[PDB]
Structure 1
């Protein structure tokens, strides 16, 4: 009869057939990931082509229902999600060119192999050969060689490809009534039609700058401390007044600073909180790790894992004969099928990753009552944030003592909390200026603020201004230094890590206030608290049905992302860094004083 009922029946049929087809595609992807064989690759490609053709046909059929004659918010949200053209608005030649460019960037990044000139008989791939050198070497010229040679090969291959990529993506985005591709990415946080809780695409950049302006003193003190410690490690390369050399940050790109914990430890004489040896002594299997994680999630009041989870998940590496992807991934295959694909070792990192992926599984289970096209996070930040809060809670020494993994006579003094907070800052705080600088640079590239001949002169200028990292030698416009990273070369949004980092500590403060913890925020554990789990599950059950601003009101009581929980989390470390930086100079100079 009416347009709204027609759209509701169309959405119901859509949902019904979509769930089954997504199940088939996800099961084919699972069979590829647990069994790398050519027929599984062919089945995955066939299922993906069927899924994409079905999404094309439902996008073609959804547009015939006009939006303004529908008053129900959930129906309007699903129709808005379905009616997006995607690449279909672009011409077939340019769409084929864009798909070819994305595939060849994927092959260039995945099969990029670089080794030393005059020794070409064997070379090391993108990850295993070079990751260990970047994370463990202490030699200046070896890291400089690896960094400059990999950015030479990858940038000189990818620069014309990226120049075509920006033009094609801007054409697709302006064909979809967006300002640029950056506006297309910022439209994920756009809330329209809700009174008071509306969020605009232009408000996101202002909120990111407003939060980063409060990030900046803590990052300046951390940068000064890491600069002083790297001056101790490398005597003559690092200047007291200048930026850090780029190849010394412990990773390939500077994404994380967590590989500098050995060099920048405050109290090496004090012990670590490593519980690996205790699990080795008690012979803890990975099944016991996941059962302890399930005990953690039932302690907070969340539902326990299904029988199909224990039957159908691969929680151990299969062997030499059978090949599988080693990356830990939680799979919501559809129809109540939830699995974890992780090659779990007996380490603290795999235990925290098991908690993180089971948090992903709990988030997927919570919105199982929702319709299929609303089965997502309210934004891209919440989905990772609900795993990162489990990674926060499981890593606490109180949780390790509660489950018996830590000795009951372990002395928790201030020095171990300071060095633990410094490790968490090197992991968590250090990625924030890199993320903000990369996303702001990509937004200015898509917006056309930076011409193609001036991409890199601005970029290093941004890195000195924001990240406080100086180039070893200057790079001209033949280089493509951003696109050596996985997310930018393979068309992924990058602001999800910034939003995840802030939502992580906002959720942590909200659940610790729910659990009535009376001490420091980093000493807080959310186990045994039914009310904290209920407050979590109230937001978790919504999925994408409600705006992320209303969900954040449901958790923390605020209508916007906030930076104060992060500063409250690291406040003992902030006071300690302010005490330790009395003689040294906080802040950096953009001049060429260390090396150029």
Structure 2
């Protein structure tokens, strides 16, 4: 009679095998990275290959149904997620043409090639392509590295860019969807929720105010860099224009600390480095993980230590076999804790270790959710919760509580603003970079921009907001724009841009709800229990509900707000205003050294 029993029977049967295969497929990758042998490749690659073929059989009949005759809104959400088509309807013939673009593109970008004119002298393997661009303070050396890393690497990527786009236009019509642009915007879709739904049209207005209101601070940061380096490098800097692309340090430009010694915010006071004393005290490497853990118990959860401290290694390769120790902490499955990291005694790595195992605390709470809804509310929440406390526990004031700081420490405010500045600039470094990339892609799929403008339009949007210009114009044979991050590596950035605004939101949500008073930039959550009880409210909610409900419970806002951001750096903003009371905060994008 009722067709619901068919839906109920499918849901349980699919989950039981999938999570078993999810554990099995995962261990093949995790074991391979801990133990790299060719016999492990066979286990690793076959388990990936066999899982997908079985998955499709279950997913084909899974989406054979739809959101019909399901009065349960929660079950309807679970079904809605599994019913995504993707490549299920994609034909095999068009798939193959895509594989050629993908496999070649990644391999050819890693091998950077830079011509070394005049042959120099007898040369060894050294120096290396990565190293040469980072240490070069000479004008010719920096440009010589940069020109090769742009011109001679973009050439190989040009043939692969256009073929990938052509298929993007074609596959849309065979996948019952208009264009790829809706897919990325539909990631935050809420459907069939009265007085509570969220729409893709809303983000366009909200993101407009974020950049406009942050821009005055970024303009000061842009002016700050130029004014200080004007004294050291006046010849290679235009006071009435943009800045040469070679001065960013590297292709990415996310790291401004390479020339930190030439742009120290306060050189009058010597370097703040007081952790050397702790280095010779010979503390164990595993204590750092406990330091985060004992922080976590403060919010009144029990401890975790039995059966999840054996599957890991610290400080030692363990054999003549080599292990990659990139930071990759995933609970393999069914509560199996695992963390691979080269844990070393370092102030910077101290917060990193907090971040790494703090990822597990997220996973442990939501591990009870069924298979199809077991993850965080949005992409950027995960890394945010790890970072907010790691920065809080890495503050020198907290060092006093744990006794790490010197007993004779006198209250300093010069040190605080310097740390926040480097913390600020790294985050805001690439927001305008991804801003032009994310917005430019959307109108590409619309179809009002033809193929010819893939050179000028990419540069035009960048100059409007970012202000980066190549010193020498490059013709169409030369391929500068090809080095974008979504074709060169095809890694999603959506976990990064919207994360930062979520990070301020999570940072502000904890403090204001915990009766916190004083400075906004410093917040204390150790020795409190109210925050964690509210924390667990969505730390274990999961995706059984849209993220909108959790947003209203913790704070009470269903939209994204930027106003608190100005209060965060109130002491910092004063110093920036004081130093630039004479110069003009801004630049002319239209002026060029050529003309």
Aligned to 1:18: 18
Task: Measure the CA separation in 1 of the matches of 2:9 and 2:24.
Answer: 23
Query: How many residues align structurally?
Result: 593
Residue pairs, 1:93-104, within 5 angstroms: 93-104=93-104
Aligned to 2:471: 472
Bigger mean CA offset, 53-62 vs 22-31: 53-62
TM-score in terms of structure 1 length: 0.92
Query: 1:522: how far off?
Result: 1.6
Is 1:492 the equivalent of 2:491?
Answer: yes
Partner-residue secondary structure (3-state), 1:286? coil
> 2:359·2:382 contact (CA, 8 Å) conserved in 1?
yes
Aligned to 1:381: 380
> 2:112·2:129 contact (CA, 8 Å) conserved in 1?
no
Partner-residue secondary structure (3-state), 1:523? coil
Aligned to 1:540: 539
Task: Measure the CA separation in 2 of the matches of 1:47 and 1:85.
Answer: 23
Residue pairs, 1:289-368, within 5 angstroms: 289-302=288-301, 304-318=303-317, 321-368=320-367
Q: Which has the larger radius of gyration?
A: 2
Task: Measure the CA separation in 2 of the matches of 1:58 and 1:19.
Answer: 13
Task: Measure the CA separation in 1 of the matches of 2:242 and 2:155.
Answer: 26
Task: Measure the CA separation in 2 of the matches of 1:360 and 1:99.
Answer: 33
Gaps of 5+ in 1: none
Structure with a larger share of its residues in helix: 1
Task: Measure the CA separation in 2 of the matches of 1:302 and 1:113.
Answer: 53
Change (3 A) 1:87 1:420: same
Bigger mean CA offset, 81-90 vs 414-423: 81-90
Task: Measure the CA separation in 2 of the matches of 1:356 and 1:488.
Answer: 29
Query: 1:112: how far off?
Result: 4.3
Query: 1:248: how far off?
Result: 1.8
Change (3 A) 1:361 1:88: same
Query: 1:383: how far off?
Result: 1.8
Aligned to 1:443: 442
Is 1:57 the equivalent of 2:60?
Answer: no
Task: Measure the CA separation in 2 of the matches of 1:298 and 1:81.
Answer: 35
Task: Measure the CA separation in 1 of the matches of 2:133 and 2:207.
Answer: 30
Change (3 A) 1:590 1:319: farther
Alpha-carbon displacement from aligned partner over 1:138-158 (angstroms, at most 9, x marks no partner): 223222222221222331111
Is 1:67 the equivalent of 2:62?
Answer: no
Aligned to 1:284: 283
Aligned to 1:242: 241
Change (3 A) 1:595 1:381: farther
> 1:506·1:566 contact (CA, 8 Å) conserved in 2?
no
Query: 1:488: how far off?
Result: 4.2
Alpha-carbon displacement from aligned partner over 1:275-318 (angstroms, at most 9, x marks no partner): 54243122233201111121222224455434333111334351
Change (3 A) 1:176 1:484: same
Change (3 A) 1:346 1:185: same
Partner-residue secondary structure (3-state), 1:585? coil
Task: Measure the CA separation in 2 of the matches of 1:543 and 1:564.
Answer: 28
Aligned to 2:107: 107
Change (3 A) 1:537 1:316: farther
Alpha-carbon displacement from aligned partner over 1:461-491 (angstroms, at most 9, x marks no partner): 2121111222232334445545536554333
Residue pairs, 1:13-412, within 5 angstroms: 13-112=13-112, 114=114, 116-117=116-117, 118=119, 129-274=128-273, 276-302=275-301, 304-318=303-317, 321-412=320-411
Task: Measure the CA separation in 1 of the matches of 2:486 and 2:273.
Answer: 31
Task: Measure the CA separation in 1 of the matches of 2:420 and 2:10.
Answer: 52
Query: 1:237: how far off?
Result: 1.2
Query: 1:110: how far off?
Result: 3.7
Alpha-carbon displacement from aligned partner over 1:332-382 (angstroms, at most 9, x marks no partner): 211001211111222122211111112211111121111112111212121
Task: Measure the CA separation in 2 of the matches of 1:88 and 1:122.
Answer: 51
Change (3 A) 1:240 1:346: same
4+ residue segments displaced more than 6 Å: none
Change (3 A) 1:329 1:83: same
Aligned to 1:574: 573
Partner-residue secondary structure (3-state), 1:338? coil
Change (3 A) 1:419 1:449: farther
TM-score in terms of structure 2 length: 0.92
Alpha-carbon displacement from aligned partner over 1:543-575 (angstroms, at most 9, x marks no partner): 222222222223332112222333322222222
Task: Measure the CA separation in 1 of the matches of 2:42 and 2:576.
Answer: 55
Bigger mean CA offset, 41-50 vs 404-413: 404-413
